Design a protein around this ligand. Structure first.
Ligand SMILES: [Ca+2]
Ligand SMILES: [Zn+2]
Ligand SMILES: [Zn+2]
Length: 384
């Protein structure tokens, strides 16, 4: 658990948000207007923090002791610094839109968008309501209830253990890919907010991990977080091949899928499935003749059977973890660059995370838990 929140610390936390706004306002960045838009998100977050701070005028002591708020204010500060220090490494590079520095900045923009949607849904109108927060899914709610009570936020370790007992997680690699999908704010905790979003995306709860594995980890269709212009641009490659479709998440509508697709007229359209789980929109859109070729590919998965339990290669996980971010980054901390390789499993990571896993009596390789017989140094930005 992080320490307490005295106002001295919310103040620094605002001086930082201001530094990132300045850095990101630079005309050279020519940051795309399109969401997630960090130049809106930070002001907005600042403004809700004030809203919160006003509703706790007398009660400023019981606010400081709120676990969720302590974790959130510490993540906000860490992420705000990671952004600042990003600009400080990247320098001149920040100014070309396809840089790895600029890629990282776009991953962070998303995280800010997730932290605000969490803050607004846990402190609606400025008042803590996390202990009452309703998990949209009966079975999922039961799970959180039975395992966690009215806790708003739980550490990943605890969450992983808990979930494992009902939907078994067979390998550190699967676990790492799971954590990659649920842990939206990237702080090593799961909130009842994130838990609700996930369980909605990958319902029905009865076959949860089996749904995520088939829709997210090994589906060519899955695009994770895309803008709509980004969807159109990826389908344009297939504008002459009716039935081509991809599906994506939307930072402005957490918890819902959006399917893009190519029609026989040479048009890209888009629909939000709302009624069923995604795998039933996809099964139906196939039967109907609309969703045929995921990402342009002729071999489209067979999802029936989601209603003989498809297994996943460790490689498929590894590649899936690499999916969200630049390759340069350690997918343990999501903060530093990779700089070491682990024999004989082959996994990459930053030296800091590795010696940390060891110092904490971790079992072998932080990813797969297999035994290291050796390690070796790698450089991720060779020409700099
Ligand atoms: Ca989190
Ligand atoms: Zn790391
Ligand atoms: Zn490994």
């Amino acid at each position: 658990p992080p320490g307490t929140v005295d106002k001295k610390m919310v103040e620094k936390c605002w001086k930082l948000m201001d530094k990132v706004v300045r850095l990101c306002q630079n005309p050279k960045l020519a940051l795309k207007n399109s969401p997630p838009y960090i130049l809106d998100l930070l002001p907005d977050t600042y403004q809700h923090l004030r809203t919160i701070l006003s509703r706790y005028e007398g009660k400023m002591e019981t606010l400081g002791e709120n676990e969720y708020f302590r974790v959130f204010m510490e993540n906000l500060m860490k992420k705000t610094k990671q952004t600042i220090s990003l600009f400080k490494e990247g320098k001149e590079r920040m100014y070309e839109e396809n840089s790895q520095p600029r890629r990282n900045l776009t991953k962070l923009s998303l995280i800010f968008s997730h932290m605000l949607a969490e803050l607004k849904g846990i402190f609606p109108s400025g008042l803590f309501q996390g202990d009452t927060f309703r998990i949209t899914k009966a079975d999922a709610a039961e799970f959180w209830r039975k395992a966690f009570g009215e806790k708003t936020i739980v550490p990943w370790k605890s969450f992983r253990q808990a979930l494992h007992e009902v939907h078994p997680i067979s390998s550190g690699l699967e676990a790492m890919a799971l954590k990659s999908t649920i842990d939206l704010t990237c702080n090593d905790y799961i909130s009842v907010f994130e838990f609700d979003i996930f369980t909605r995306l990958f319902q029905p709860w009865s076959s949860l991990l089996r749904n995520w594995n088939s829709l997210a980890v090994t589906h060519p269709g899955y695009m994770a977080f895309l803008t709509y212009d980004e969807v159109k641009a990826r389908l344009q490659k297939f504008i002459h091949k009716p039935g081509s479709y991809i599906f994506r998440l939307s930072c402005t509508r957490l918890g819902q899928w959006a399917i893009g697709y190519v029609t026989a007229d040479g048009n890209i359209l888009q629909t939000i499935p709302h009624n069923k789980p995604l795998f039933q929109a996809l099964i139906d859109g196939f039967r109907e003749g609309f969703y045929l070729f995921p990402d342009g590919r002729n071999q489209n998965p067979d999802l029936t059977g989601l209603c003989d339990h498809i297994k996943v290669t460790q490689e498929q996980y590894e590649l899936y973890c690499e999916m969200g971010s630049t390759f340069q980054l350690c997918k343990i901390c999501a903060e530093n660059d990779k700089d070491v390789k682990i024999e004989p499993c082959g996994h990459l990571m930053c030296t800091s995370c590795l010696t940390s896993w060891q110092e904490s009596e971790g079992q072998g390789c932080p990813f797969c838990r297999c035994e290291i017989k050796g390690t070796e140094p790698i450089v991720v930005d060779p020409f700099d």
